[PDB]
């Protein structure tokens, strides 16, 4: 996160840290005691599928405390439509092997109904994005969880306010822009998979997943987020599915 603040411990209690072979990989969002949403692109380079861990209740990556809870990742489910190395359909649904225990420091973010999310949450201007990613484009990552308030744009506005870059990715219906085009504030590579969370009448909901961007906080560009509202029925059906023997599952979408 560039130009954000430290999220005070416990105040982002749905943020997940994902680890592969014990090393920081990406963020994620807890949505109930068993299931975590993250970004598909976080898994493009994985060879060791049996060594993924989700950490809940994490705050300072330099010190362990009694609020952290680790769980093995049993399944990673990504839309079959997603193409590694690209931006569209950038979502992954992760099944933990054992549930986390909800505590003051560990709480899921609500996955909203689609229509509520399209007709109401989409017009809440500001939402929060978080993670332990880079503090400056191509800079060092953060040791304390960082959080940033970003305003959302309709795609027509984002296109109209964005500097043209030859051969850049299309912003599709499965994405939305959020942030600032003045170089001050954005999410960053190592925030990938982390929540864009929206507060509405006293409850917080998952609306976006940190996904891609032209650098970080680059002038003339916004952050791009996976549009979670397009995946509600896909996630809800998969959360009712039977576990399978291998970790990765590429499931049909829609």
């Amino acid at each position: 996160i560039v130009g954000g603040k430290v999220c005070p411990k416990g105040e982002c209690p749905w943020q997940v840290l994902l680890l592969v072979n014990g090393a920081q990989l990406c963020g994620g969002t807890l949505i109930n005691t068993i299931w975590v949403v993250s970004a598909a692109h976080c898994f493009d380079k994985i060879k060791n599928w049996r060594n993924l861990i989700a950490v809940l209740g994490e705050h300072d990556l330099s010190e362990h405390d009694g609020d952290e809870q680790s769980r093995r990742v049993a399944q990673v489910i990504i839309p079959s439509t997603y193409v590694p190395g690209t931006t569209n359909h950038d979502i992954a649904l992760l099944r933990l092997h054992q549930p986390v225990v909800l505590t003051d420091h560990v709480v899921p973010l609500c996955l909203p109904e689609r229509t509520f999310s399209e007709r109401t949450l989409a017009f809440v201007r500001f939402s929060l994005v978080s993670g332990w990613g880079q503090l400056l484009d191509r800079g060092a990552t953060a040791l304390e969880l960082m959080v940033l308030n970003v305003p959302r744009l309709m795609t027509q506005d984002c296109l109209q306010q964005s500097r043209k870059v030859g051969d850049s990715p299309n912003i599709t219906e499965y994405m939305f822009c959020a942030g600032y085009s003045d170089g001050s504030k954005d999410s960053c590579k190592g925030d990938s998979g982390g929540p864009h969370a929206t507060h509405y009448r006293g409850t917080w909901y998952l609306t976006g997943i940190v996904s891609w961007g032209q650098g970080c906080a680059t002038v003339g560009h916004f952050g791009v987020y996976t549009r979670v509202s397009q995946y509600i029925e896909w996630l809800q059906k998969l959360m009712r599915s039977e576990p399978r023997p291998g970790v990765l599952l590429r499931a049909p979408f829609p």
């Binding site: 005070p8 105040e11 209690p13 560990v106 709480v107 509520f116 509405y200 006293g202 409850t203 917080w204």
Partner: protein, 140 residues
Amino acid sequence: AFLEELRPGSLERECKEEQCSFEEAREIFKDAERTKLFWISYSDGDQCASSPCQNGGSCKDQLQSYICFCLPAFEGRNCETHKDDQLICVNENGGCEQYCSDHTGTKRSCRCHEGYSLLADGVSCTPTVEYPCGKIPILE
């Protein structure tokens, strides 16, 4: 009536008690700008005469136009929109705290995420579990 035309010019007699033409008014005021200033309003017409403000609204006349002032339950240029008839889910979520469902022919209803139940007020939601989704307990 020629017998009513025997006196010197008079704004009151010619333009107030009667309708007057631009030149009758000019002969009274003489100066071009004074005459124009009078005439622009005098010949304008009361645009509130057609009573365009609905639902008990109040009309104020302007030059070639009017303004309606509505009672609190109404809006629109002519107070034509009933605020009471706008209880639908695209209008600030139907006033529902969490989920909103439209029902044509009848009133919308409000609903809640898992972990919450609807209060008796029909809009507000309350947790039914210790750690419902989307609340930050550390702050409380």
